[PDB]
């Protein structure tokens, strides 16, 4: 049995390194949103709330994790508070991640009413409510669902603890049925699965909208060829009626002027077709190609460019949520083995430490995802770093 302070010194040193990195990176995130008005939107208010939770991981949760690794003597409910506080921060992160996914779904599904529905004031209130619910969920053991009623008196006596004190260890005060059923299954796993469902709807909605853009583009060009090789006025009328309805479907200053020309030129050719003037209607329909090359194709391309940027932003947000799950699942899976397999030896202490360090490292990774995937964050990070450090 090697001296406990040796392995403890490695764990503590790594934790402090993570704490420094989590504070520095996420303070940079908050400073970038504060300075850059192009970053001041509802989506990034939840990003800041998430960064604040990660700052508090370095300032409070990691010092608390270091403290509870010592098993020091403490009043049981005080031990319970410093053990449960990380649950508050994790829950707050889940609420922010779920809000970000929903915010991106609203923007892709109903962009015409996104600015009216999703405002900064309503976002600040949602953030406040989610922080309150995070304290209620994470400190639920403080309300009585704890093991303070059944202290490990032998462990407490062997460490010289006083009356009412226990050796402060996470699994001695926080009930494992809380950790598995309430915290993991209900409060972590279910919201993560909801997020997965939201992102599946975002990508399915983007793929369908991009398909609809190309369908209207193909229908516009196909019916143009139909008019050219038509032999009577009725065939020209049939193709023009399909173009007029599709031109209005794709319409939903230079943008409006382009479609005003397009619909008017269709009406011009339609009137000639209804008068039995096939050659004159076909020549009038040929003028649609000039409007298509100068206006309609530009709108198609900019509409496509906007959807591809929303896909890119949703993937970046999904990477953040997926990395949260990857970093926290080992801890929860270990708790499942402890809880569901009492015939299995408990996961060894070094693996517990590794799983804790991994969870804490998630508070370091988000600034790097923003810097590598979001140009506005990357450029703002450079301005802050070049001008102030
Ligand atoms: C404004 C912010 C920064 C203040 C942070 C306050 C923190 C550090 C305080 C608040 C409550 C405190 C705990 C309250 C009760 C106990 C029981 C005692 O037997 C050991 C210490 C312990 C476990 C305390 C540790 C420090 C503690 C967690
Ligand atoms: C944010 C919410 C939780 C309130 C903020 C105040 C917190 C940080 C402080 C204020 C008073 C503190 C409590 C005061 C008294 C006790 C009883 C003792 O046997 C163990 C510590 C314990 C349980 C403290 C835990 C932390 C505590 C609840
Ligand atoms: C992709 C990520 C999320 C997967 C994480 C898988 C990890 C957490 C799993 C894979 C194998 C698992 C181990 C397999 C066997 C045992 C032996 C048992 O006596 C204690 C638990 C323990 C030690 C498990 C702990 C958790 C474990 C290490
Ligand atoms: C990752 C998402 C999608 C699902 C999460 C999977 C979790 C809940 C699964 C994956 C592997 C599972 C464990 C695999 C093996 C055992 C050993 C058995 O003696 C008791 C149950 C137990 C401990 C399982 C509990 C639940 C478990 C941890
Ligand atoms: C003992 C432990 C005590 C430890 C302290 C507890 C900290 C709790 C919450 C901080 C939450 C900060 C959340 C900041 C988000 C701000 C934001 O997102 O801004 C929106 C913007 O204002 C739209 O107009
Ligand atoms: C404690 C953690 C600090 C977390 C709170 C940090 C608050 C930063 C405020 C911020 O960055 O947002 C400003 C907002 O965008 C303007 O509209
Ligand atoms: C910025 C700060 C700079 C540096 C701050 C460093 C703080 C380290 C403080 C105490 C660690 C004491 C370590 C003692 C750990 C005892 C060994 C142990 O792990 O025993 C646990 C056992 O599980 C129990 O029952
Ligand atoms: C500006 C940011 C805000 C400041 C953030 C606060 C930082 C808190 C640091 C460490 C918490 C450690 C608390 C636990 C220490 C307990 C050690 C102890 O109490 O030991 C005596 C006890 O009786 C055992 O026998
Ligand atoms: C149990 C309740 C404990 C108190 C919870 C503190 C929530 C504080 C600030 C939310 C910040 C939102 C700013 C916008
Ligand atoms: C939100 C709720 C958190 C409530 C936090 C306050 C919990 C106080 C714990 C407490 O009352 O201490 C137990 C008592 O001293 C033993 O006899
Ligand atoms: C485990 C513990 C769980 C605790 C369970 C109980 C929690 C209460 C739940 C939600 C409160 C919702 C907040 C309502 C605050 C007022 C919102 C409001 O006024 O909205 C009007 C706004 O103008 C519209 O646009
Ligand atoms: C709002 C919730 C207010 C909760 C008030 C917190 C009191 C917690 C408390 O003192 O509970 C001791 C024990 O855990 C219970 O049996
Ligand atoms: C998502 C939620 C999955 C929740 C489904 C979990 C249902 C598990 C029920 C169960 O595990 O039964 C207890 C058994 O006796 C072992 O202790
Ligand atoms: C989402 C997955 C939900 C539940 C998985 C957990 C189910 C694990 C429950 C099985 C544990 C069990 O039955 O233990 C056997 C007992 O120790 C020997 O008789
Ligand atoms: N058995 C066990 N032991 N320790 C922790 C623990 C304590 C402090 C922390 O800072 C961290 Cl990250 C983890 C968890 C645990 C597992 C999942 C979610 C929250 C806590 N589970
Ligand atoms: C990927 C992120 C994980 C970082 C890995 C750093 C390595 C070790 C962290 C500390 C866990 C092991 C310490 C051994 C202490 C012991 O033996 O009990
Ligand atoms: C580019 C600037 C980076 C900032 C530098 C700060 C890095 C320091 C990080 C970790 C060092 C940890 C100190 C550990 C002290 C001893 C703890 C112990 O053994 O118990
Ligand atoms: C994780 C590490 C990112 C930290 C890079 C240093 C620049 C941040 C400076 C600061 O604003 O505090
Ligand atoms: C520990 C908590 C650290 C959080 C740091 C967050 C920094 C970002 C924004 C805070 C608000 C800005 C404060 C001074 C602004 C001065 C100015 O705008 O010129
Ligand atoms: C920027 C402010 C950050 C706060 C500074 C906290 C840094 C100190 C690091 C870890 C706290 C150590 C807790 C001591 C455990 C007591 C051991 C014992 O009593 O047996
Ligand atoms: C003990 C906590 C359990 C009950 C949780 C109650 C939910 C949170 C309560 C109040 C949050 C206060 C902020 C409300 C302002 C809303 C602003 C808005 O949405 O536009
Ligand atoms: C496991 C359950 C997780 C997610 C359920 C998925 C529900 C959404 C998928 C179909 C919606 C869509 O793409 O249109
Ligand atoms: C469980 C989650 C597993 C992996 C998360 C890694 C990144 C996944 C996001 C998909 C990107 C689109
Ligand atoms: C992504 C692959 C991971 C690469 C580095 C991480 C190392 C993996 C660590 C632990 C995996 C399982 C270790 C087995 C625990 C011992 C079983 C026991 O004795 O109870
Ligand atoms: C990735 C890193 C995982 C490696 C951590 C190994 C330290 C545990 C020591 C041991 O096996 O007893
Ligand atoms: C644990 C997570 C490890 C790596 C992902 C973070 C690095 C992101 C840069 C792109
Ligand atoms: C034990 C390692 C301490 C901190 C590890 C953090 C590494 C993950 C974050 C960013 C990847 C670099 C790009
Ligand atoms: Na987090």
From Swiss-Prot:
Disulfide bonds join 73-161, 76-148, 79-168, 341-344. The keyword Cell membrane applies. It is a multi-pass membrane protein. Residues 35-44, 103-122, 201-316 are cytoplasmic. It is found in: Cell membrane. Residues 4-9, 69-79, 146-175, 341-348 are extracellular. Keywords: Cell membrane, Disulfide bond, G-protein coupled receptor, Glycoprotein, Membrane, Receptor, Transducer, Transmembrane, Transmembrane helix, Ubl conjugation. Adenosine binds at residues 171, 335, 359-360. GO terms for cellular component: asymmetric synapse; axolemma; dendrite; glutamatergic synapse; intermediate filament; membrane; neuronal cell body; plasma membrane. Glycans are attached at residue 156. The keyword Phosphoprotein does not apply. Ubiquitinated. Deubiquitinated by USP4; leading to stabilization and expression at the cell surface. One of its GO terms (molecular function) is alpha-actinin binding. Its main location: membrane. Signal peptide: none annotated. Interacts (via cytoplasmic C-terminal domain) with USP4; the interaction is direct. May interact with DRD4. Interacts with NECAB2. Interacts (via cytoplasmic C-terminal domain) with GAS2L2; interaction enhances receptor-mediated adenylyl cyclase activity. Receptor for adenosine. The activity of this receptor is mediated by G proteins which activate adenylyl cyclase. The cytoplasmic C-terminal domain is necessary for targeting the non-ubiquitinated form of this protein to the cell surface. This is Adenosine receptor A2a. It comes from Homo sapiens. The gene is ADORA2A.
């Amino acid at each position: 049995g090697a001296p406990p302070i040796m392995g403890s010194s490695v764990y503590i040193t790594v934790e402090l390194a993570i704490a420094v990195l989590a504070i520095l990176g996420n303070v940079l995130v908050c400073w970038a949103v504060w300075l850059n008005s192009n970053l001041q939107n509802v989506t990034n208010y939840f990003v800041v709330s998430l960064a604040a939770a990660d700052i508090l991981v370095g300032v409070l949760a990691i010092p608390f994790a270091i403290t509870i690794s010592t098993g020091f003597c403490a009043a049981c409910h005080g031990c319970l508070f410093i053990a449960c506080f990380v649950l508050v921060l994790a829950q707050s992160s889940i609420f922010s991640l779920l809000a970000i996914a929903i915010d991106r779904y609203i923007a892709i599904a109903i962009p015409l009413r996104y600015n009216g529905l999703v405002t900064g004031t309503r976002a600040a209130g949602i953030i406040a409510i989610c922080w309150v619910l995070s304290f209620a969920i994470g400190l639920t053991p403080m309300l009585g669902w704890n093991n303070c009623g059944q202290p490990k008196e032998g462990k407490a006596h062997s460490q010289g603890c006083g009356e009412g004190q226990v050796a402060c260890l996470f699994e001695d005060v926080v009930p494992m049925n809380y950790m598995v059923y309430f915290n993991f299954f209900a409060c972590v796993l279910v919201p993560l699965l909801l997020m997965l469902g939201v992102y599946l709807r975002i990508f399915a909605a983007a793929r369908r909208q991009l398909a609809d853009l190309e369908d209207n583009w193909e229908t516009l060009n196909d019916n143009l060829k139909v008019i050219e090789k038509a032999d009577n006025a009725a065939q020209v009328k049939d193709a023009l009626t399909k173009m007029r309805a599709a031109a209005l479907d794709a319409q939903k200053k230079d943008f409006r002027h382009g479609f005003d020309i397009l619909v008017g030129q269709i009406d011009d050719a339609l009137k000639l077709a209804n008068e039995g003037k096939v050659k004159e209607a076909q020549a009038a329909a040929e003028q649609l190609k000039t409007t298509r090359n100068a206006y309609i194709q530009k709108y198609l391309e900019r509409a496509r460019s906007t959807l591809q940027k929303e896909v890119h932003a949703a993937k970046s947000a999904a990477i953040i949520a997926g990395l949260f799950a990857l970093c926290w699942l080992p801890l929860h899976i270990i708790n499942c083995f402890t809880f569901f397999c009492p015939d299995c030896s408990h996961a060894p202490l070094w693996l517990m430490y590794l799983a804790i360090v991994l969870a804490h490292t998630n508070s370091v990774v988000n600034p790097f995802i923003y810097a590598y995937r979001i140009r506005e964050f990357r450029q703002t990070f450079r301005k802050i770093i070049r001008s102030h450090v």
